[PDB]
Design a protein around this motif. Structure first.
Motif, short mmCIF file in Angstrom:
data_model
loop_
_atom_site.label_atom_id
_atom_site.label_comp_id
_atom_site.label_asym_id
_atom_site.label_seq_id
_atom_site.Cartn_x
_atom_site.Cartn_y
_atom_site.Cartn_z
N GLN A 1 47.61 -29.06 -67.25
CA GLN A 1 47.90 -30.37 -66.66
C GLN A 1 46.71 -31.30 -66.68
OE1 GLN A 1 50.27 -27.81 -65.45
NE2 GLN A 1 51.05 -29.16 -67.02
N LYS A 2 45.67 -30.91 -67.43
CA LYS A 2 44.46 -31.73 -67.55
C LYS A 2 44.07 -32.20 -66.20
CE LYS A 2 45.50 -33.85 -72.01
NZ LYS A 2 45.29 -35.09 -72.79
N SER A 3 44.03 -31.29 -65.24
CA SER A 3 43.70 -31.70 -63.88
C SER A 3 42.42 -31.06 -63.44
CB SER A 3 44.82 -31.28 -62.94
OG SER A 3 45.09 -29.90 -63.09
N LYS A 4 41.67 -31.72 -62.56
CA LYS A 4 40.41 -31.15 -62.10
C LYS A 4 40.64 -29.70 -61.67
N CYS A 5 39.95 -28.77 -62.30
CA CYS A 5 40.06 -27.36 -61.94
C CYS A 5 38.72 -27.06 -61.33
CB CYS A 5 40.23 -26.51 -63.19
SG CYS A 5 40.12 -24.74 -62.90
N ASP A 6 38.70 -26.40 -60.18
CA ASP A 6 37.43 -26.08 -59.54
C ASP A 6 37.24 -24.58 -59.44
N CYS B 1 41.38 -20.65 -58.99
CA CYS B 1 41.23 -22.10 -58.90
C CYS B 1 42.09 -22.66 -57.76
CB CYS B 1 41.62 -22.77 -60.22
SG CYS B 1 43.21 -23.66 -60.19
N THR B 2 41.59 -23.72 -57.12
CA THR B 2 42.31 -24.35 -56.00
C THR B 2 43.76 -24.69 -56.32
OG1 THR B 2 40.20 -25.36 -55.35
CG2 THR B 2 42.21 -26.14 -54.22
N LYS B 3 43.97 -25.60 -57.26
CA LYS B 3 45.32 -25.99 -57.63
C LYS B 3 46.17 -24.74 -57.87
N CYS B 4 45.57 -23.73 -58.49
CA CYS B 4 46.28 -22.47 -58.76
C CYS B 4 46.64 -21.77 -57.45
CB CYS B 4 45.43 -21.54 -59.65
SG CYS B 4 45.46 -21.97 -61.41
N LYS C 1 47.89 -23.73 -54.45
CA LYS C 1 49.15 -24.39 -54.13
C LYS C 1 50.24 -23.74 -54.97
N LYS C 2 49.94 -23.54 -56.25
CA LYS C 2 50.90 -22.93 -57.17
C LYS C 2 51.02 -21.44 -56.97
N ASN C 3 49.92 -20.81 -56.59
CA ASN C 3 49.92 -19.37 -56.41
C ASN C 3 50.41 -18.79 -57.73
OD1 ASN C 3 51.96 -16.87 -55.82
ND2 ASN C 3 50.17 -16.74 -54.47
N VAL C 4 49.51 -18.79 -58.71
CA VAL C 4 49.81 -18.27 -60.03
C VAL C 4 48.55 -17.58 -60.54
CG1 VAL C 4 51.39 -20.16 -60.51
CG2 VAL C 4 49.00 -20.35 -61.18
N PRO C 5 48.71 -16.74 -61.57
CA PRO C 5 47.58 -16.02 -62.16
C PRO C 5 46.62 -17.02 -62.78
CG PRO C 5 49.59 -14.89 -62.64
CD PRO C 5 49.98 -16.25 -62.12
N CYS C 6 45.53 -17.29 -62.07
CA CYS C 6 44.51 -18.22 -62.54
C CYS C 6 43.67 -17.59 -63.65
CB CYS C 6 43.62 -18.62 -61.36
SG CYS C 6 42.43 -19.89 -61.72
N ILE C 7 44.21 -17.55 -64.87
CA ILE C 7 43.51 -16.98 -66.02
C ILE C 7 42.41 -17.90 -66.55
N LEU C 8 41.42 -17.32 -67.21
CA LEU C 8 40.30 -18.07 -67.77
C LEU C 8 40.11 -17.73 -69.25
CD1 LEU C 8 37.89 -19.67 -65.86
CD2 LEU C 8 39.97 -18.64 -64.91
N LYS C 9 40.92 -18.31 -70.13
CA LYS C 9 40.79 -18.01 -71.56
C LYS C 9 40.08 -19.13 -72.29
N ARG C 10 38.75 -19.16 -72.17
CA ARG C 10 37.88 -20.17 -72.78
C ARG C 10 38.38 -20.73 -74.11
N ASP C 11 39.21 -19.97 -74.80
CA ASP C 11 39.75 -20.38 -76.09
C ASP C 11 41.17 -20.94 -75.97
OD1 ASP C 11 40.59 -17.64 -75.40
OD2 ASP C 11 41.72 -17.80 -77.30
N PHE C 12 41.53 -21.47 -74.79
CA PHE C 12 42.88 -22.02 -74.57
C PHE C 12 42.97 -23.53 -74.75
CE2 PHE C 12 45.90 -24.07 -71.58
CZ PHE C 12 47.05 -23.81 -72.31
N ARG C 13 44.14 -23.99 -75.20
CA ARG C 13 44.38 -25.41 -75.41
C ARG C 13 45.81 -25.76 -74.96
NH1 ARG C 13 40.30 -25.94 -80.68
NH2 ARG C 13 40.13 -23.69 -81.12
N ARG C 14 45.91 -26.65 -73.98
CA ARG C 14 47.21 -27.06 -73.42
C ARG C 14 48.29 -27.27 -74.46
NH1 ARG C 14 49.48 -30.89 -73.16
NH2 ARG C 14 49.91 -31.32 -70.94
N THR C 15 49.53 -26.95 -74.10
CA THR C 15 50.67 -27.13 -74.99
C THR C 15 51.23 -28.51 -74.72
OG1 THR C 15 51.29 -24.77 -74.86
CG2 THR C 15 52.95 -26.32 -75.67
N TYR C 16 51.56 -29.24 -75.77
CA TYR C 16 52.12 -30.57 -75.58
C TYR C 16 53.62 -30.52 -75.40
CZ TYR C 16 47.81 -32.91 -75.53
OH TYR C 16 46.57 -33.36 -75.10
N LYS C 17 54.05 -29.95 -74.28
CA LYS C 17 55.46 -29.80 -73.89
C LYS C 17 56.43 -30.82 -74.47
CE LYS C 17 55.02 -26.81 -70.59
NZ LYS C 17 54.12 -27.32 -69.50
#
Ligand code: ZN
Ligand code: ZN
Ligand code: ZN
Ligand code: ZN
Lengths: 65, 65
Positions: B9-14, B23-26, B28-44
């Motif tokens: 979501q191109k949102s501030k991740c802390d 991560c904080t936002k993660c 509210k969502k309560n989801v697996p806050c993964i960290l895959k340095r090689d990741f790139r958002r999908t253009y839904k």
DNA sequence: TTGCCGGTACCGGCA
DNA sequence: TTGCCGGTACCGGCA
């Protein structure tokens, strides 16, 4: 009532009000402000989600036939 | 850097900041806050739009074969 | 190469 | 059978 687009985004549409002039939001957008009293917003998310699921299988079909 | 989701979501991740705690936002969502340095958002949007276009033809194919 | 702002697009519900 | 608020989800760009 509500201009198709406003109905789509479930957003305040101000047609009747702002006369023959297309709905306000439809301004910013500058799009054909249609009025199809029998229209119902498409649930994009959920929809496309189904689509993808369907389109999937088909391939897994081609994985055979 | 940025947790996958925030990257999505191109949102501030802390992450780094708020320690081992996801991560904080993660939150509210309560989801697996993964960290895959090689990741790139999908253009839904654009993506699914392609999907639908593809899935279409296929049917128009079945309109023959 | 990659973080995020500022601004729509969507939608779950509640009338 | 609908209008829409209040809150995310998405992203085009600008660093
Ligand atoms: Zn409108
Ligand atoms: Zn309109
Ligand atoms: Zn994050
Ligand atoms: Zn996170």
């Amino acid at each position: 009532f509500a201009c198709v687009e406003c109905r789509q985004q479930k957003s305040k549409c101000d047609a009747c009000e702002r006369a023959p002039e297309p709905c306000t939001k439809c301004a910013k957008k500058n799009v054909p402000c249609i009025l199809k009293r029998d229209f119902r917003r498409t649930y994009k998310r959920a929809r496309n989600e189904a689509i993808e699921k369907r389109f999937k299988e088909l391939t897994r079909t081609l994985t055979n036939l």
